[PDB]
Assembly symmetry: D2
Homo-oligomer: 354 residues x 4
């Protein structure tokens, strides 16, 4: 791999509904977004079947739950502008049509919830800068104008809340390094300058919060292995050194915090199967990678069920969505084998960033 | 103090709205519930002023946020039945009237959200058993019939989710010990038998989850000091031994998890001022108690703002509500002095359990 | 129990030799010190048999290993002065006669090794102050004059190194509180003033260092339960609050750090059997007490073998020494039942402090 | 660098005496071992001056403290056999001549103390296997015959005790991977087979024990950065995955456990200055590397003083030994600048393993 590579992305975006049922969003061969969901938040739930949103799209969709429980999806349209749709009532299959947010978008959209309930969307714009737009009232269709945060992006953005409620955004720069920018006051339009975390990355960055309130960032490195970095915390503006983990990965990573508070990461491995690693103690060292049977054709998308069980979604060799999951809430639970969520086939609609 | 004492309770119940503004509920000298709120989730926010719900009540109110962001309050009526009211839209001051849930209630109500979005209410009933009632569909006015969980209660109940989504309820028994009972499958009507945690307690129990997914229970003991106990976790059904902390307390305790992941506890101390203790490291030992200036007339009620700042509410010597808070999100932040939230005076409406 | 009680002490002092064999020292019905040892540092070792030191004594003996591996024992004589004897070669049963260190002693002696290799002995003196005496050259028979550290003692002293090499001494005061005093520079005659840790104690204090370099003190409290306190560390001069653990104990406690870095405490319980508690996680909560079969007649004395296995010594109902131990180095190892180390019977020679 | 490289070694071996004074051993331009020491275990101690052992040698010397406090040095002679010398009394400058242990040695010697007090020496032999020899009685000149442990070595060996008293040896193999072999019972001639930890290394391995009883191994990797691996512990035979830390190093690393229980590592960096990294929390992430002023000409050798202060020794550009140290015991202590321990110049006598 070249320093400017961007590892294969996940094939769906996933959210928990207000009642914690999982719901997935992808793009089919008709270039429309389709979605599917658990019919109940139970370990044996059926899935509803694939349902289409009318309209042709031109990015991977991004979904988030509003602070009033309603899911809302963001996507680039055929006009290269940002569009969104939403549940009109929480937990209900009554959706808006696609509605315009305008702009000129040159990445997949990334959505985050501010600590005051307002959704915020981050994209690369027509000038390769980071641009953003936000709800001006929590869980309302009153959106700001577009505003630039500058920079020069070469990955999709990844956004996450700090423990103190400040959004922080991570994106690869023109030097192939990881850069980041943050709100300097929680849920306010007061932002830092861009700063570099150094290190070349070859995937989009993925971010999660630890127990202790420290963000941790994962990405593939120049040598095609997973690497990670974390905030020092305790009111320091600093970050740790980077660490790599042995094992060549061949997709973006996906991180999750298990219900014991430990981090886990999933990624497609060198043999094209799903790999998993976990922290073996608090803050710990990391386990050797463990493999699940079966060749997969995307990065994993990882979620947690109502009961904490971890569930993983991937593109199969049949171009359909498959999943596996923990059979119990235990961190030592056994896992299922891949099962098909059939009814459509999927395409990787991610925006080709070059 | 006698083994059967129940330490002075908090004077309000508090919730975060969908947009994370704090909102408080208490009972005035007209025996009606009144509420007040931050007008914005900011460190300098004004408060709206006290607003009345019409209707006479006969318990402390309990508030929870639905899974669709709407606040909902539970209280005993003049008929000794359970009543509830709610926001008809998240973040909005449009409330239902008090609506009936019936029953015969002999404690304050305790409300919890299941891991599938459904509210559930626990009370002591006419026979001194634990009784419960629940939404049958998340965030809907479709409620179950009343059902008994048995037992013999001598405190108000305290309910909390386990990390795996099972509700667990704690209440003092006929022997003045702490007892508990739990869902054996997440968000299902499948419950354990009652089991004893031994130890005499002289307050209602207070429960919180740690980072690591272990519940921790706090209560005043027979010697009038704070004591605590925690789940061993890692798939064990066991709990630790009890520990007491030196320092005589004269109210119920209130616990919070700070945005660094450490536990803190607040309680009125032996000198009738607010005391605070914190874990000094991960799982740690606990700090000596620290005092805030000012004689207080209830237990503290503790909450976190949108940005993580901890805020504490108490009854003053003027019979009004006062608060203080961290001025920044830092775990070493300074604190304000008591400030008045004026406009009404409050009574302790808690049900007299004897 | 009265606040001025001092819980029953251990019946032997124990050390590891230079080759890590365990060796025990007690006083028989002839009022002489006798000793016994493992013949090899193995899980199945025989014990050598009891060997007498000639001479009548009037305290419990205290043993320490010199920095050149030789064991050295300290005891009060019939003249109320301090005496000592030593191995003349490490691991060898060639001992000096009892040799005089003079003084006037009114407690058992307590011995510690400074971080520069010099033994130091602490006693209560004729005036009830803490007095001390030390090697002036490591592992040599060149001893200082006696020097007073002042105070007013009502327990035997307990001494331990801080992580930074400063000796710290703990002893109950005239108010029945725990007090302490320390070197302010490592292995130097530069000492603090006495300071109080407050809390009444009803045993001698017992001290151990944690992994993280923080001292932790254990003692029985006024309510006859175990209590503990620890340094906050990270360059703070402070200590935590005290915590008690439920369960009435009827001897002094004995603490050990297991080879996983967690603390364990042993004590005779309310039913006169040996009880054990352990930290269940790092810094953790503490386990419920677990009991071993058999009524015992002293506090436990606890040690670790060459391989980390924990071993416990007690006075039996036959007035002889018994022991039990972990059968493997695992922190989940099984334990033996009491086994007799026969050949003599023992008396409690501890100085009657009143 | 090539996979078969072995990074520049430290220029001295160091030990603490029985009284904890530091003492260093190196080889001068006369091909003899010389030594120097602190005259007192104090922060301002003078050093004694360089003292010669007569006799020409052909490896780096290795020093250890016996279980009776006497230092003992091991070196290869002009006959390619192993020789040793020792203090005849602890803390005293009365040394034996070089005495023969025979053998045929093709690496530097590595010495470890068993958990029963017996020294043990590990070398690569004439057949490239690991060979060993040991005291048969603790701290005595009664040595075993030579015995082979097999394997094929391409680095010097590194030995360390497990928490349970079993010696474990680490060495690079014929595939340039890290391999290891261990006692299966503490301080017994019962050994495992060789097993591979995989990963190519380009230095000798360096091993330390954590607080929690888990060994951790450090080495330079194929990409010239530091990497590390640790035991999972809790009775597992497993190890973690490898992690690398960013930053190119140009010597072997040296690890230390600070008196707060956290690990630190020192190494010459890419700019030929001394670099340091530390764990920022328990088990933590690792800090960015920090540099000390001054170009150095060996790996660092790191030690701790009687009071815990960390001290580092290096070859200077003048071919003499220099050191720097923490001025206080605090983990946030300031550090001195390089100071010269003058009187001789040193050579790197390490055995050329190719």
């Amino acid at each position: 791999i070249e320093n400017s590579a961007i590892a294969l992305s996940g094939i769906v975006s996933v959210a928990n509904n207000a009642d914690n049922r999982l719901e997935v969003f992808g793009v089919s061969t008709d270039s429309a977004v389709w979605h599917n969901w658990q019919t109940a938040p139970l370990p044996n739930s059926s899935w509803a079947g694939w349902n289409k949103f009318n309209g042709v799209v031109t990015s991977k969709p991004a979904v988030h739950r509003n602070s009033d429980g309603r899911l809302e999806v963001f996507v680039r349209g055929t006009d290269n502008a940002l569009w969104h749709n939403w549940q009109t009532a929480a937990d209900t299959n009554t959706w808006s049509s696609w509605q315009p947010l305008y702009g000129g978008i040159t990445s997949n959209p990334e959505v985050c919830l501010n600590s005051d309930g307002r959704l915020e969307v981050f994209v690369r714009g027509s000038d390769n800068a980071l641009w953003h737009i936000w709800q001006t009232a929590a869980h309302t269709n009153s959106w700001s104008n577009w505003k630039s945060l500058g920079g020069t992006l070469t990955s999709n953005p990844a956004a996450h809340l700090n423990a103190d409620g400040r959004i922080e955004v991570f994106a690869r720069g023109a030097d192939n390094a990881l850069w980041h920018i943050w709100q300097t006051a929680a849920h306010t339009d007061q932002w830092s300058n861009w700063q570099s975390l150094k290190s070349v990355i070859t995937s989009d960055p993925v971010v999660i919060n630890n127990c202790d309130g420290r963000l941790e960032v994962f990405a593939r490195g120049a040598d095609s292995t997973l690497r990670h970095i974390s905030q020092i915390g305790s009111d320091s503006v600093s970050w740790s050194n980077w660490q790599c983990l042995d094992g060549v990965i061949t997709s973006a990573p996906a991180a999750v915090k298990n219900i014991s508070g430990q981090l886990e990461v999933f990624a497609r491995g060198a043999d094209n199967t799903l790999w998993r690693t976990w922290q073996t103690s608090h803050n710990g060292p990391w386990s050797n990678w463990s493999s699940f049977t079966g060749i997969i054709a995307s990065a994993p998308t990882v979620a947690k069920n109502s009961d904490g069980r971890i569930e993983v979604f991937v593109l199969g060799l049949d171009k359909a969505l498959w999943h596996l999951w923990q059979t119990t809430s235990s961190t030592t639970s056994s896992w299922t084998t891949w099962a098909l969520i059939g009814g459509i086939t999927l395409i990787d609609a991610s925006v080709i960033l070059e």
